[PDB]
Motif scaffolding. Sequence first.
Motif, PDB file in Angstrom:
ATOM      1  N   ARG A  25       0.824  -1.211   0.000  1.00 35.06           N
ATOM      2  CA  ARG A  25       0.000   0.000   0.000  1.00 35.06           C
ATOM      3  C   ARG A  25       0.855   1.257   0.000  1.00 35.06           C
ATOM      4  N   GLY A  29      -5.035   2.797   0.128  1.00 38.38           N
ATOM      5  CA  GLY A  29      -5.871   2.094   1.077  1.00 38.38           C
ATOM      6  C   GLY A  29      -5.352   2.192   2.499  1.00 38.38           C
ATOM      7  N   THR A  33      -8.126   2.604   4.628  1.00 38.75           N
ATOM      8  CA  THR A  33      -8.398   1.396   5.430  1.00 38.75           C
ATOM      9  C   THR A  33      -8.137   1.653   6.910  1.00 38.75           C
ATOM     10  N   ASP A  39      -9.581  -4.692   5.021  1.00 36.27           N
ATOM     11  CA  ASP A  39      -8.367  -4.874   4.231  1.00 36.27           C
ATOM     12  C   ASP A  39      -8.586  -5.953   3.181  1.00 36.27           C
TER      13      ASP A  39
END
Lengths: 645, 645
Positions: A25, A29, A33, A39
């Motif tokens: 990542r 995200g 996230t 995830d």
Amino acid sequence: GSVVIVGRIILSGSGSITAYSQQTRGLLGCIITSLTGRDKNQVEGEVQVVSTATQSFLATCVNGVCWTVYHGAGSKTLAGPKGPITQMYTNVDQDLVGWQAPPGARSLTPCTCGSSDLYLVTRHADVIPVRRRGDSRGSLLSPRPVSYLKGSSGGPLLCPSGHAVGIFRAAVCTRGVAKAVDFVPVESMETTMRSPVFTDNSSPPAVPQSFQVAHLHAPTGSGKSTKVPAAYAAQGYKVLVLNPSVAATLGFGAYMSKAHGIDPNIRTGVRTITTGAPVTYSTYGKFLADGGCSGGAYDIIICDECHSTDSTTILGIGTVLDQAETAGARLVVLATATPPGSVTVPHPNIEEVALSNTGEIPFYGKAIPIEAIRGGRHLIFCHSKKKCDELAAKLSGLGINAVAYYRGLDVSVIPTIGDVVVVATDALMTGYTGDFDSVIDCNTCVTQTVDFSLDPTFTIETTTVPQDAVSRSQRRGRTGRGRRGIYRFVTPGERPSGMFDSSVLCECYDAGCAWYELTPAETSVRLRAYLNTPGLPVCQDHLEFWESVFTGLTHIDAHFLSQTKQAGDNFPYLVAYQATVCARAQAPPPSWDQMWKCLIRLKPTLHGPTPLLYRLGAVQNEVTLTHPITKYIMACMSADLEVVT
Amino acid sequence: GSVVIVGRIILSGSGSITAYSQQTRGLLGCIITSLTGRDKNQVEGEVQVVSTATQSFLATCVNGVCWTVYHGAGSKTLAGPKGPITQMYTNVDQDLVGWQAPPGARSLTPCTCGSSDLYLVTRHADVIPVRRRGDSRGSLLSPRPVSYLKGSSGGPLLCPSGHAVGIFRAAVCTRGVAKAVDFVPVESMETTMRSPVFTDNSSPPAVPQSFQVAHLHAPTGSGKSTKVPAAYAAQGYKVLVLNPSVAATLGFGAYMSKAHGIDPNIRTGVRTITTGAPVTYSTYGKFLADGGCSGGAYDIIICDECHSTDSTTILGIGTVLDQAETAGARLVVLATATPPGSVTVPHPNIEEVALSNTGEIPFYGKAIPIEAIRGGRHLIFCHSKKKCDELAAKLSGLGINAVAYYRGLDVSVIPTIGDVVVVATDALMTGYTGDFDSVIDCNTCVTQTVDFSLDPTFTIETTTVPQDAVSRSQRRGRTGRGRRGIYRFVTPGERPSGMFDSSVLCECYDAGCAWYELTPAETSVRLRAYLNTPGLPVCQDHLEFWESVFTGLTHIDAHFLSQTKQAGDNFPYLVAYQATVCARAQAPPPSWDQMWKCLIRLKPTLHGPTPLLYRLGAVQNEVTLTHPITKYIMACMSADLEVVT
RNA sequence: UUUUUU
Ligand SMILES: Nc1ncnc2c1ncn2[C@@H]1O[C@H](COP(=O)(O)OP(=O)(O)O)[C@@H](O)[C@H]1O
Ligand code: BEF
Ligand SMILES: [Mg+2]
Ligand SMILES: [Zn+2]
Ligand SMILES: [Zn+2]
């Protein structure tokens, strides 16, 4: 703010250990996230590179459990497939947490080989030779700046065969140069899987045959400091009870006389009352002032509010735990309704409503609708006195009955009856008991941290930080007691509870020296006992260091100490000592801020550079480093100092 | 991504100047908006709180334009209603940028009362009285630590009648305490608005009748270094072409004869090929060694790759600028494909492809498919020359013909013809044409920054950071020179271009003393010519400060200086000087790292603490701060240091 | 732990 796997460290499976990083990542995200907590990326490898919004570090799979440090992950969930994942293990005492290993995550096997040649994998996929020295310590072969090791907490210490030996948690430094590492052994991880999921102690412990230290975890308003002593004393026991707040201590005799028909001793620096009863109520301060424990006067000593991380309570408890047994007590009880790691749960009497930007009253970037506080009794927490003063003034200007409350002010300013808005700092808690129709919370605190800055020595700095679990819960807790409350907040954000800063240790020594005629050596014995005690909040072990500093602060000017004590500001000892060194050197203080007011008469007499011992705030004047106390404190800086990575 | 409006500061409409802050966006809204560049929120007010993915600061609307500082915003778009808004003004010289104010935002009115009583609005809505002292300076009535002004860049300074006088850009400090503020005066916004929005320096400047400094901006591989000097020569002019790279300056030798039927003089340390041709090529280094400008020798001096901010380039360009007119030049041309404020835009010769996690060769958290370099000519940039060694060895163990280049190695190591994978540092970033099919880029590099840490003096630190826009465009531009090319990268972003650190000015003085026989005063003259010239990279003006430091470093040991110069590592003067002070005290160096290898043979006779002058790496040895040179430099730290907050 | 004067 969920924890998110943002990459991985690939380890060799055979031969000499090598590693390389793969990043999965790129903040993409990640911070996203970080919130969703879901995830969608698949978990491979055994060493995870993890990251929050603010911090990045590591996590290590062992026995099918993903492990990392509490100091880094707190109680934060792990992001994964079925959204956020709750921690399965949370062990503050050992600085260790663990989630269950996500899909496709392989674990390392615990080292059985008993080797002393170890290797540390860092978040840069460096493999650093470490020579085991302890069960939880290993010397580095090539010392490195601590900065190199940062973000590597949670990473594995592997043996030569590649078996997990422990996870990296801290570096032992010499003037910021890391020369050894502290780690959590895999046996601790084993002990943690094998501990009873739940350990009840909602119950007043039986009085042991021999001396015991015991814990007592029960929610506020359960008789912890009222009923529980009224049972013990009922069984003909002598009860000492130590609370952090004078206001709370006082208000006990009057209630104990009520709902329990006893007239207990109450001790405070404001009011001593000896009724000759079995049960006594004293603050930590007052207990400390009275020299601590004395010849078999008590069988049970409850340390109420044992969770608070203020220098006074910490030092008080440490004095108990070191003396009680010799003072002929049979039981010590550490009571709290919020042990370390504690987390913020919904509360039945309390509806929680976020502030928005709509309102007539600006408040920390958001706003407060006037109808929410006109009429009723309300408590608004501000992070500073200046803010209390400003909002109280603005509210009064709107015809709203409003008062500011903070340390230095007398409780009388708070009306016990009728409509009011009380705008207060956290000082409210130590000096007032009542409750309110609602609480509005800025969600920030003011804290102090020590920086081992070597310029020339150390620096104590004040900063505004987001609140911790203990803060939200005690602030929210001033409403919804025996009735309906509302809790309005600026942020949902919270922070791990259970740890405090090294500067608080420094504060304990200062107080020992200023207020209790305690030698640094004596203060150490008492802090040692506190640190040696499981269940309590935790701090880096810097006792030897702080002890060494205060030890060399000899022959302070008594008149200066008197002025700083009376004025009531932080570090009266260190402030008075720097004032003493200055005056004797015929030199000016670091600045003419009110911190240095005790020196104002001498102002016309003092000239040239300040013989600076340490930094307690802004330094405006020129500085000389030639004073022997300065050099003395400089020599103290060379001691091993464990700091977390 | 884009800059995002995440809040605003509201100013009072009447009476005393007061402010409060509204926060309109949390962190999640921030990043999401930052990447769509799509912000639907109504914009109100004259003062926005803005944020990138790293920092946060302020922007003030004036005369219809939303303004902030270049050091905060770079050349980033501003998230808006329809999508990202591109900057309308980018004035690196004044540290000033501006977007057309979104609808709803209102402007402050400029101050025309010429009042010298001003009020700075900070990001936390404090209103700080300031006394105007100069056009762009003001003193604070109550000096404060720098950290207090952090994030306040772009905030307005207002007169008593609420007008805008300027915007805050930097704090002027004494030992970390801000006593004054530097701001961009409102008249620079007017001056900026009264020059055009678009400009083109893409054609070769006309030789002017009287002396002029001009700029040449044109894409990588367009003919700046070759065709342009060829054309000026073809017209009867004598051309000096100064380049930072030795490999490029040698390249030009053989390429110019077949390509433009010119065989140019050449000057470098290694080769001083003389032909008498009217075009001379030279490195900035050899030019400085030769003593700069020689009367009557040239009509046109081309400072090529003037985006380069290595110390030799800064000092060489500064020397041309101070000397060229007196030496009879008609025209100085500052030439580059990547001037300050520029960003990487698509190159017609280059296709760009993000590396992925899939491939055989791990490369900085991603991976390289061996099929992308197996055949052809390829240049791979790594941040360290060590990573170069490692990678090139990895590749050579896969059947690839890979060579690792950096300074120290000869230019011959690189095959001119046939399949190859050159693994290079930024020794090959600028100027060079090596006929490469593809460039692969780690997107990071190594930089030095100075920290005024007062422990005891200053610290020079080496870190690896994300690449800036010059770097991305220059590295990428090593391919697709006269044909199609491929660019493979690890990360998509880039930091703004055109700024350099104060440590570079330190290196110039060091180089001046070490290599070019310049007194620190002479060095200042040249650096000042550079800092006074518009359109060049910018830096904080710490010229007086650095000069004071080097002026005090006298009687260096010529033997140690000769060894640090030859060894080729950074700060040979500072290193040898510290080595000198240690040897004369029979004390050891700060550590036994290779930095201090000139002292290795003396180890057995060196004992005790290091008389530490400054920090140039990790200090492992005990230190003493009593040496007279240490105190000389400490007294140097007391001068006014402008620093951006 | 990147350029250039050796
Ligand atoms: N040494 C060389 N070998 C082969 N081709 C070259 C060489 N130098 C320049 N060229 C060609 O000449 C063109 C102009 O190069 P140059 O003047 O270096 O461009 P710029 O200076 O604008 O980057 C390039 O596109 C390249 O194709
Ligand atoms: F712009 Be070229 F690569 F010098
Ligand atoms: Mg060129
Ligand atoms: Zn093993
Ligand atoms: Zn005005």
